[PDB]
């Protein structure tokens, strides 16, 4: 019966195991305040066919546990929202780099929200729960890993803040801690804070994770758990590696020193050398599995590449540790898009598109996530597309691709703190990747900054994104870090052989978004601190060059942009204009793309993406308001009025046959105070000459006064 | 093209062959009244790569043939409704147990609604059609089978009642019969009716199936079809089986005689013996297919397990036939849930949660599902969840698993007859299975009864579910049942090697739901009658245990429960409160989760899950109704209203130059009812004393009275 209390200042954490889902390999329950999340870990005992661990993590969100039914067509949990996916990816990046190398077995980690009390967000709890569940099962691991969330309010750092605090916080930082104060996963989003606060926040965050790790350590000792031995680890034998090293080290060395090689040329040289070595290895060791052969070659290839970096301080093209790839920019690419930007760094090419839209499209039907977390007060959202042809590949473009969604959210957080609070249109920014060579997401963010900057939206200041690469010479005995080198403007091949990915973006003043994908089993703070410092210098550089293309936003939005118009519609015409069940409005909306909303009984807001569409809508409404032929607005003209209804306070008379009758009151019927029109000898259907005094919008009745004629 | 008519009391059944889709192996058309259903059957001649029944049954609902249309964007029949899935599962469980053993060939049975009128029903027709279609094709089969539906109205049984009568009828039972009056499929729902009536309904139902099965025999004899010979049946050779029996019976008998093994320990010991035996088989028989070896071991395993049951009347755990596993219950797990229940039976553990919701979430836009089944009268629906980790298994978390849907419907039918007629909230009951060891569905139903019972919804009485298992000593020549034993509270291992599953749930007095998944090719009615009788005793026993944990619903709902309020929004601010297209209301709904409905022009219904959330909504709406400079002024006050315009029907005035120009009618201007404002010396911009008589909403005009001052 696991039972451990952990104290984090004003917050208490309850960790319990057993009594729930005892059939699974590892089951844990994490309770904070009144919200509790239970996590299960299942690992197969059969070597799955693959060259990698098939780790799959899901974070299902129970809407019913929050007191709401999902707004799906089936009133039930169907599909997964982005928020779940982002949370899952956070968990995946948080725990993956702790498994022993070569462990290739199916492993599913599932998170369930037992109950959400609406006072404590559960995402941070889930990460800790997985760590508890894993460390409490037989599955081999090197954890446990502690996770906290740090927010800043009024210059005060608060761990695990409540919903109200997030909305009021300028910084949302998630820190994942490993033993001996090692950071394993970093993720943050800030309203453009300075660097110094970021330094202090991290130092606090790891400090708290140390406490949480002690409790889990205490819990494991109390319960007692034996780690099952896997059937067979898939690491290559040293002999195959060493033979591989003696067979390709010089050729690979030559390949990686060719500063003129592009992405493609380098791979082909790498690939062809791979073939020759693979044949020779098969000759020497036919008994060896192909998986081992392929793995061995990669290890040797990875090893030498890193060695070159550690020694000669030249990555692949003579570039130093701080130099950047060539950067190109282009704006106003087409004459139609409201905002266009062509951003190309080195070989990576990214296209960003800015498109305005009506405020009606910004409805967030997903209530539970917006209730628990909140809504982006700025009507802003981003699309990130990674077509397969961007990497000379084959596949299907899916909007639910986890890698695609994760990158997009990172860009969205990057650009968020610069959108002005108030704007008469939703800003839907679409970024498309055309040629990918690493660090696409930051490049996507930069281009979006450019396209928006051209679109005329008065943003605060330009936003720059840059990735950071690292290589460490590891000491095999203790696993500590011997030496390390930091890379700026990382290349794709650098990432693959690299140890960790550091995506940080912000503005000239401070930092907005940060995401660190690490693969080592932990890194000390000092390395991270230098990385931020190094990234800042390049950030200033990349902003400096980008500013030459454009410096200030356009004084006005580009022509052919969206237009907003308001139209007066008389109530009599309203039924005609709307049509039965509003079908006419839908048809007009479907046909010309013009979005029309009813401001009130007489006025209708009309949105048109183009003035041409505005003209089409203006014509259509003019036609609809023309069949309801309301005569000219005259104050002294006398028109025949058809007495439709004989009331007691007056006569409902239709001055024109194209609209309903109005209260020709007894005070508007005769100069004497009549109180029944029957005293005037008025019959139904009789035409009475009533002077037209225009229309009175106060009561919706056109001003008719028969008293001036009688 | 064979044709035949079958008389069922007041209803006629027409079955025709040929004339339609002659290309398929088996094509049949079933016509009742004016509803006709076509059933097709296809069976590939090549042995399937699978190692079991690759049977797939689908039943599509063409809304066009029912005078309706689907409510999807594409207007097509995109996706499958639950009702379709339940119908398909009914058919599958109705024909599967008649295929010859080992027939491993792809087979798909499709159902189409040629035309659906407003009287008869397609489901019962579909089952009969499949039986006709199979028996008319060259697919090996031991059919045909007959399916009828029995309803009870005014204590009178009616076969195949019209959909107009389902709502009136207190019972809805489906019976599928085999030759020699053998039941195959049993599916029933009822309103807590007595056991005796259930007995009579079954006796009648099988009796009618004897007629319908008789007719099909007439048709097939008339047409004279010949069943094709399969390439090869996949039953293991008797010789191999005998060797296994002589090699594994001793150890297997030892394993199952243990009374200490859990599920996990028992299976692995079985699995361990399986590995040893399988290896030795390969030694003896290298020619045999590996799958045959696997199948042979299972067969002798099954035979021994059933054998030991028959001879010693002791189940695999050390219980008796009537005894049941120990049961534990717990309520009120977390203070942030309107109702929680933890139900544990044996090793099966199930969690049930009760979540109230606003009535608006209960909309079910589906034309056909009401075009046939009928109307809804209890705003309540259950969600059943069977996550993979509940069985130490890795899978895909997805709510479209057929097994999940089938179990969920069974629970929903189980609890239906106890929900009150009316309730100010929808009742979404979510049950999650945490540890599965068989009979989870009834356990889920029981827990839902508990959680509901805790939630404070006043129900009729507690609901108990139990499963029944049967083992038969079969005569290999006749196929009749020489001997049989019944098992209460069946274990998963018992089920897998058992003969049939009997899920029946009811109250302390009667029976609500009954699903009988059977795998034998038919069982006599006397068998079922005993099973229900035995199940009745257990149901009382479970209720005896459950009553200790709770016996009556709470006096009221939980404090944090949902709240109801009505707000009087002034008409003047109504547009501002609503906004263009109700955008504010949509925004308000997404922010706090509080839903708003327009009771009328002045009253708005507000539904909140928590009083705290309501408090937030109340502040927001109060702010919206107060932030305006134009507020509800004090009644009866006199204001010096400036005249903005002089007209005929009255005078447009504003109390202070922030409000709008309001029409003070001539009847409201003077006691003698002057008819021109200039009669009082009024001018443009002149300030006049008028007493503020409140705001009566009839045309948007704010009330004033200058008549008293004259």
Swiss-Prot record, chains A, B:
Example of a GO MF term: identical protein binding
Induction summary: Up-regulated in cells upon senescence and terminal differentiation. Up-regulated after treatment with IFNB1/IFN-beta.
GO biological process: cellular response to interferon-beta; cellular response to oxidative stress; liver regeneration; mitochondrial mRNA catabolic process; mitochondrial mRNA polyadenylation; mitochondrial RNA 3'-end processing; mitochondrial RNA 5'-end processing; mitochondrial RNA catabolic process
Cited NCBIfam families: polynuc_phos, PRK11824.1
Disease linkage: Combined oxidative phosphorylation deficiency 13: A mitochondrial disorder characterized by early onset severe encephalomyopathy, dystonia, choreoathetosis, bucofacial dyskinesias and combined mitochondrial respiratory chain deficiency. Nerve conductions velocities are decreased. Levels of plasma and cerebrospinal fluid lactate are increased. Deafness, autosomal recessive, 70, with or without adult-onset neurodegeneration: A form of non-syndromic deafness characterized by severe, bilateral hearing impairment with prelingual onset, resulting in inability to acquire normal speech. Affected individuals may develop a neurodegenerative disease in adulthood, including ataxia with loss of ambulation, optic atrophy, dystonia or spasticity, and cognitive decline with psychiatric features.
Record-stated family: Belongs to the polyribonucleotide nucleotidyltransferase family.
Name used for this protein in its record: Polyribonucleotide nucleotidyltransferase 1, mitochondrial
């Amino acid at each position: 019966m696991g039972a451990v209390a952990v104290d984090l200042g004003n917050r208490k954490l309850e960790i319990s195991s057993g009594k729930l889902a005892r059939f699974a390999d590892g089951s844990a329950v994490v309770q904070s305040g009144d919200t509790a999340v239970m996590v299960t870990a299942v690992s197969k005992t059969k070597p799955s066919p693959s060259q990698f661990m098939p780790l799959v993590v899901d974070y299902r969100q129970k809407a019913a546990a929050a007191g709401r039914i999902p707004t799906n067509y089936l009133r039930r949990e169907v599909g997964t929202s982005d928020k779940e996916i982002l949370t899952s990816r956070i968990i995946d990046r948080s725990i993956r780099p702790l498994f022993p190398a070569g462990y290739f077995y199916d492993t599913q980690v599932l998170c369930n929200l037992l109950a959400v009390d609406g006072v404590n967000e559960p995402d941070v709890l889930a990460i800790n729960g997985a760590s508890v569940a894993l460390s409490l099962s037989d599955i081999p691991w090197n954890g446990p890993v502690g996770a906290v969330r740090i927010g800043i309010i009024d210059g005060e750092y608060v761990v695990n803040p409540t919903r109200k605090e997030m909305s009021s916080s300028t910084l949302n930082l998630v820190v994942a801690g490993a033993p001996k104060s090692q950071i394993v996963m970093l993720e943050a989003s800030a309203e453009n804070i300075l660097q110094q606060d970021f330094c202090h926040a991290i130092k606090v965050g790891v400090k708290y994770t140390q406490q949480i790790i002690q409790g889990i350590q205490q819990l494991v000792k109390e319960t007692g758990v034996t780690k099952r031995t896997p059937q067979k680890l898939f690491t290559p034998s040293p002999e195959i590696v060493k033979y591989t090293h003696k067979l390709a080290m010089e050729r690979l060395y030559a390949v990686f020193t060719d500063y003129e090689h592009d992405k493609v040329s380098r791979d082909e040289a790498v690939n062809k050398i791979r073939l020759d070595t693979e044949e020779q290895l098969k000759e020497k060791f036919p008994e060896a599995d192909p998986y081992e052969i392929i793995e061995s070659f990669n290890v040797v290839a990875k090893e030498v590449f890193r060695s070159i970096v550690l020694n000669e301080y030249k990555r692949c093209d003579g570039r130093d540790l701080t130099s950047l790839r060539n950067v190109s920019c282009e704006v106003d690419m087409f004459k139609t898009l409201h905002g266009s930007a062509l951003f190309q760094r080195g070989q990576t090419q990214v296209l960003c598109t800015v498109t305005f839209d009506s405020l009606e499209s910004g409805i967030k039907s997903d209530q539970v996530i917006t209730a628990i977390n909140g809504i982006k007060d700025k009507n802003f959202m981003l699309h990130y597309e990674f077509p397969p042809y961007a990497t000379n590949e084959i596949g299907k473009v899916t909007g639910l691709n986890r890698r695609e969604l994760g990158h997009g959210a990172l860009a969205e957080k990057a650009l968020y703190p610069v959108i002005p609070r108030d704007f008469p249109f939703t800003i839907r920014v679409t970024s498309e990747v055309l040629e990918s060579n690493g660090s696409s997401s930051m490049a996507s963010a930069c281009g979006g900054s450019l396209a928006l900057m051209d679109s005329g939206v008065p943003i605060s200041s330009a936003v720059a994104g840059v990735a950071i690469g690292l290589v460490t010479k590891t000491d095999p005995e203790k696993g500590e870090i011997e030496d390390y080198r930091l890379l700026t403007d990382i290349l794709g091949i650098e990432d693959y052989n690299g140890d960790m990915d550091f995506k940080i973006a912000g503005t000239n003043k401070g930092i907005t978004a940060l995401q660190a994908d690490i693969k080592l089993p932990g890194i000390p703070i000092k390395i991270v601190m230098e990385a931020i410092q190094q990234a800042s210098v390049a950030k200033k550089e990349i902003l400096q060059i980008m500013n030459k293309t454009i410096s200030k936003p356009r004084a006005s939005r580009k022509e052919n942009g969206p237009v907003v118009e308001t139209v007066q519609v008389p109530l009599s015409k309203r039924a005609k204009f709307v049509g039965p069940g509003g079908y006419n409005l839908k048809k007009l909306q479907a046909e010309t793309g013009v979005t029309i909303s009813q401001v009130d009984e007489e006025t209708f807001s009309v949105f048109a993406p183009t003035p041409s569409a505005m003209h089409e809508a203006r014509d259509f409404i003019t036609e609809i308001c023309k069949d309801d032929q309301e005569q000219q607005l005259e104050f002294g003209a006398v028109y025949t009025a058809t007495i439709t209804e004989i009331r007691d306070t007056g006569v409902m008379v239709k001055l024109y046959p194209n609209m309903t009758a109005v209260l020709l009151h007894n005070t508007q019927l005769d100069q004497r105070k009549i109180k029944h029109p029957t005293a005037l000898g008025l019959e139904v259907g009789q035409e009475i000459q009533v002077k037209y005094f225009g229309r009175d919008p106060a009561d919706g009745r056109m001003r008719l006064s028969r008293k001036v004629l009688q």
